[PDB]
Amino acid sequence: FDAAPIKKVSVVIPVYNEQESLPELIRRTTTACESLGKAWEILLIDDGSSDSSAELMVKASQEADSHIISILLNRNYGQHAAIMAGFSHVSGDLIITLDADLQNPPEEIPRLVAKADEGFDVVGTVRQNRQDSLFRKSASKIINLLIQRTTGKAMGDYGCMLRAYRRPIIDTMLRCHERSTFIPILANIFARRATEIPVHHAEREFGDSKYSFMRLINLMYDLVTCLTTTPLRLLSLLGSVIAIGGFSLSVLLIVLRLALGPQWAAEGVFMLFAVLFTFIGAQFIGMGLLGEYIGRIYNDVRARPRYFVQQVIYPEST
Amino acid sequence: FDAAPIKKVSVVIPVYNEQESLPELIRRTTTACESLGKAWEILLIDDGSSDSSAELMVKASQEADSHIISILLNRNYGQHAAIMAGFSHVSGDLIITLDADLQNPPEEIPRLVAKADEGFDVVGTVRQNRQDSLFRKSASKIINLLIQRTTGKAMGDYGCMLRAYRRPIIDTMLRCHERSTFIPILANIFARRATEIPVHHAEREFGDSKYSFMRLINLMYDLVTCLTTTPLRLLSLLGSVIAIGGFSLSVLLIVLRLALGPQWAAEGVFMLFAVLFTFIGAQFIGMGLLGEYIGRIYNDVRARPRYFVQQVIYPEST
Amino acid sequence: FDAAPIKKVSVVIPVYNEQESLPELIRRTTTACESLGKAWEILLIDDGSSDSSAELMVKASQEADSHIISILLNRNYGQHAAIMAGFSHVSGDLIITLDADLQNPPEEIPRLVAKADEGFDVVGTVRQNRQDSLFRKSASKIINLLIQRTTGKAMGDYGCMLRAYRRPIIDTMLRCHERSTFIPILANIFARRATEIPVHHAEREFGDSKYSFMRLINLMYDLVTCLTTTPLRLLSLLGSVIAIGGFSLSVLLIVLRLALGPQWAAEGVFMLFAVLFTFIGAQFIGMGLLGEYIGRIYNDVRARPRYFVQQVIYPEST
Amino acid sequence: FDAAPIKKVSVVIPVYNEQESLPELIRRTTTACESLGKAWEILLIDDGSSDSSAELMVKASQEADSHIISILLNRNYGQHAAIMAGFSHVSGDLIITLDADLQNPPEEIPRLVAKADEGFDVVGTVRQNRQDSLFRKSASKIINLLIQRTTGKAMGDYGCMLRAYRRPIIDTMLRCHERSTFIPILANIFARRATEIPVHHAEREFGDSKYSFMRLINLMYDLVTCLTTTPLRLLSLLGSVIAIGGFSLSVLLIVLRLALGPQWAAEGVFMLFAVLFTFIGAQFIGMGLLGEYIGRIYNDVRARPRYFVQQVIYPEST
Ligand SMILES: O=c1ccn([C@@H]2O[C@H](COP(=O)(O)OP(=O)(O)O)[C@@H](O)[C@H]2O)c(=O)[nH]1
Ligand SMILES: O=c1ccn([C@@H]2O[C@H](COP(=O)(O)OP(=O)(O)O)[C@@H](O)[C@H]2O)c(=O)[nH]1
Numbered sequence A, B, C, D: 001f002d003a004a005p006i007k008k009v010s011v012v013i014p015v016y017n018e019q020e021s022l023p024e025l026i027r028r029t030t031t032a033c034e035s036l037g038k039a040w041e042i043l044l045i046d047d048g049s050s051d052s053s054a055e056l057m058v059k060a061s062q063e064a065d066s067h068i069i070s071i072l073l074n075r076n077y078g079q080h081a082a083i084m085a086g087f088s089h090v091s092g093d094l095i096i097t098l099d100a101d102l103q104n105p106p107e108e109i110p111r112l113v114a115k116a117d118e119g120f121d122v123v124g125t126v127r128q129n130r131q132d133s134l135f136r137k138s139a140s141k142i143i144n145l146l147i148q149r150t151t152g153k154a155m156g157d158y159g160c161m162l163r164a165y166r167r168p169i170i171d172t173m174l175r176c177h178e179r180s181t182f183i184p185i186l187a188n189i190f191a192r193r194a195t196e197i198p199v200h201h202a203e204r205e206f207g208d209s210k211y212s213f214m215r216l217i218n219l220m221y222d223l224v225t226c227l228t229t230t231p232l233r234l235l236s237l238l239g240s241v242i243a244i245g246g247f248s249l250s251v252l253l254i255v256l257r258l259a260l261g262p263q264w265a266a267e268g269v270f271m272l273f274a275v276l277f278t279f280i281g282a283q284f285i286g287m288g289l290l291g292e293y294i295g296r297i298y299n300d301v302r303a304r305p306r307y308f309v310q311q312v313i314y315p316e317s318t
């Protein structure tokens, strides 16, 4: 777990129509950062805000002895794209991500900085006081189950964006080819050592959440497609089940009619429907056959590392 | 909006079986360009013309003190491919695109040059006197709706090829991997600042329009495929609707028959048809599942920028 | 048509289980090449022959003052792959391709060399005395129709491998990414100027043709897939036709039953079948929608030139 | 078959939850390697073992005068990925692969080393005493049939991982783009000369086999997808068969009804079902049409060599 000590830190905050909370956010974040006794930097990214957020950001950047860098984008690209834009400019050894709605307490930064200074590459967080509602709860349960099945371990909370990373992870991720990503998952791919911290949560003080239904469906699709290619494998299973059922039912119908003779007027249509079901299952099998190669192409185009080494131990003589 | 002043301009005109209009076009364009009081250049591209257009082009290029460069292609590749070929040779700071049928008045060039000299990267145009016909009007309405939904702003008129660009945009676009493109849309992807101008329109004086039905369907397909990958997402919605309807209808049939007893001779076939509809919906869901990964692969292969920066504002101390 | 004069020539002959014809082939080819009065070279490629062809090839290469180079492959890759292997070693300015079964008269080489020396990049050939049989004739007719529709001109005869190319074409083709190709078509993509020559044809003197039914189906698939992506567009047309027919038939059934009342006992099943046909057509439309993006990806991965320039004509002052 | 003599050898052993067999394995492998009278090296790779295997590996590496290198991975990637990780560090001229369960006798190493020293690039092995059970036997029969059909020769036994390779093969394979591979097959792609050796087999002394049902299905899929793209071609054949059958049956029904008049009450539904079957076959044809291009894209993205040269024989004068 040994690592070089941290001497500078950077903070990345995506902003999108959050003029109401920005004034308090700036003061609280500045106080928290100054409480570290460490060199600090702040970067604010405007994801195509329609309100006056950009004006406040530039005004803050123009204040005397200001440590705030303002970055403007020509349109709305998304939260993670803005985070990548922020990463492209950071100069500190440790990177902190934070939300602009102020639901994440800025006062938790020093704990993350300390734990990362112990030597850990990636430090996560878990919301001890987490709202419970059937939709979010079920989604989180299924998503965490899939994540632990795939990665081999559970990360506690994936939806919390209050996290810390070291610069090498940022440099590694920034060179990836894939255009769409989920930063918390993509970070664990290159992490040699990880930990977590409990933190408390609060509701947004002003405005409304920007994640609508479609903007949430897109996020779910991105997450699932970034995790695994497994869904392409269930089509063949479903087709096999349907085909076996149809074939067995047709054979049983033939045997029953031969043994007992005619029974109903609509017997022939039933046999034809059974054959139709068998063909429909064969169609699912074919689609899964296509999906296998499609997934292979996707993985090859992605060009992720084929393996990751945790450490190498040579003897006294190489 | 500050930018370096313009000192040279270049004009690109695709030619394809337009011998009738070329003589007048050359004179009018030369007069318009000379009215600028600016260094000017003209490039004519032959997109595999079958008539004598190439002979007229070479003769014009061979005239004394001629500023016309003639470029010949071994076959018909298309309008935008010819425009790219022209861009590959331009030397001026500002680039002007114009049609050879002379429907676009060459006299509007100085206005575009002046407005671009103000500092704007991309200057468009809008046809104030635009022909109205149900086909074109509906197509334009739907296309503009989709464009404003995707890009976030409307461009006024996409079908008008009388436009201006600065050289950096040309260099950026010329290095893109994609083989098929729509220049007006691809230009806005890299534009930091854009404007528009009203202009008048006229019908072609000679000949007939070269865009047939199939040559228009191909253009529509290219435009839609260059805009977005959304169409791959509607298949799953349609499948979900069909499957839900079929399942509900089958359950209702079972409940009704149990409550009221037999009602019709053809009841079983109705249940079988309901099951068939459910499976057919599942098939659409599977095809959409494939489409998600196909779109991901397409975007990754394209390799467009993940974000574009409008400007960065550091404090007095970096 | 001006070009540098030719001073050396090279000949490429694929060999695959042709020991019977090789002795006569070597003598006739040597005589023909020596009749040119030009520096000449010969390359023989063994495509994994099971007979003693390799032994004869090496023996010929080991003869005193022999101009024959023998190349052996670890397995059977195909005719065009062997031709590419030959191209990878040629040193002459002009390249000649010839078959090993001796159906192509070696005595026609000097005519090709002379015509190429006139300046033409690519010289083809046409079989004046061509066997007629329904299978081959219909296949050639349809293939030539498609080729002339796509490329814009007809090449006369595509199945004749007796052809000539200049070295720059070979170098251009050899750097293409695509693993499967049809050399005659891929050559015309980069040819600035082409011509043809009539030649006579004969049946193979010994052995049997190596192209079986499956080995011919694979060749047809390679040719069609190298030509165009159009076949992916007919699925949507077929689906549209089927859906329109089904919808019209269902509406007509409803109208007729309302106007005239009940007519048959099996009316409901007919309506259900009409709805089923409509959905089946929608499925074809969806598959074509997928095919559009698949073809786009294929073209982008291929990375062929976006345009080819025949010549550029600057004025007296650049 | 001439090749440089071997002076150093390396051994690669994947380890995954095999603490029970590791102590005996280390001693037996050390004795076998020391019996060669040749410079030797050993590399142990931990594929994310949950038991104490890593502790034993590091302890062995820390022993005085130890020739064992221990490599740890952050998670379970697979057997072949671990073998690739081992290959990334080997320094010897010849590479030996061995299993950790000790079913492969380590005493067979010197025979492989000697035969490879004769000059062969790749040396395989065949299990003379092989367990027979319907599942494994049928799978091996079909797999070997497909392998010999594709590659042109049979390898004897593909499931035996006790094999030897020279360093150039390792370097060639290590630069391949494909993320998923089957090492024995991928090795033969670049092998100029290969041989085999009989060896005896034994059951694992401790623990249980780690290859479950799903972990075996994934391996079968990887093997088949690495071999060939043929499965995408059978869909069109099946569709053609179904469509021809349906069309013939419908025509026969029409002819029979016209000749003999009405015969059954359910005649119309039979004709409709025949039409439905024809359309279903057309759907398979379309899916195969898509599969052709998908396979082309897969092969192009893979970027394997278009041909491999066994040897070149120039005359006395080049
Ligand atoms: O398109 C978007 C949506 C959100 N955000 C930012 O992401 C954070 C999450 O805000 P939101 O309230 O939507 O998320 P919630 O906490 O309600 O889940 C905020 O800083 C937003 O400004 C953004 O930059 N772009
Ligand atoms: O394959 C084509 C079709 C058109 N054009 C050029 O594109 C412009 C548009 O001409 P057209 O009359 O077809 O378009 P319209 O103005 O009628 O929409 C003209 O300069 C044509 O010469 C071209 O270069 N290649």
Ligand SMILES: O=c1ccn([C@@H]2O[C@H](COP(=O)(O)OP(=O)(O)O)[C@@H](O)[C@H]2O)c(=O)[nH]1
Pocket (backbone or CB within 6 Å): C014, C015, C016, C017, C018, C047, C076, C078, C079, C082, C099, C100, C101, C103, C204, C208, C209, C210, C211
């Ligand atoms: O897999 C193959 C098949 C053919 N050929 C060569 O291609 C030419 C064509 O021979 P074939 O008689 O099969 O073609 P045909 O003239 O009958 O169409 C001959 O030189 C063959 O040796 C080859 O190199 N590899």
Ligand SMILES: O=c1ccn([C@@H]2O[C@H](COP(=O)(O)OP(=O)(O)O)[C@@H](O)[C@H]2O)c(=O)[nH]1
Pocket (backbone or CB within 6 Å): D014, D015, D016, D017, D018, D047, D076, D078, D079, D082, D099, D100, D101, D103, D204, D208, D209, D210, D211
């Ligand atoms: O995910 C896996 C599965 C197996 N193995 C190793 O591969 C070899 C094969 O072991 P197993 O007993 O599963 O194969 P079997 O010989 O029973 O077919 C052993 O050295 C395992 O440690 C591995 O490294 N990773």
Ligand SMILES: [Mn+2]
Pocket (backbone or CB within 6 Å): A101, A103, A204, A209
């Ligand atoms: Mn919020």
Ligand SMILES: [Mn+2]
Pocket (backbone or CB within 6 Å): B101, B103, B204, B209
């Ligand atoms: Mn026009």
Ligand SMILES: [Mn+2]
Pocket (backbone or CB within 6 Å): C101, C103, C204, C209
């Ligand atoms: Mn022949």
Ligand SMILES: [Mn+2]
Pocket (backbone or CB within 6 Å): D101, D103, D204, D209
């Ligand atoms: Mn075992």
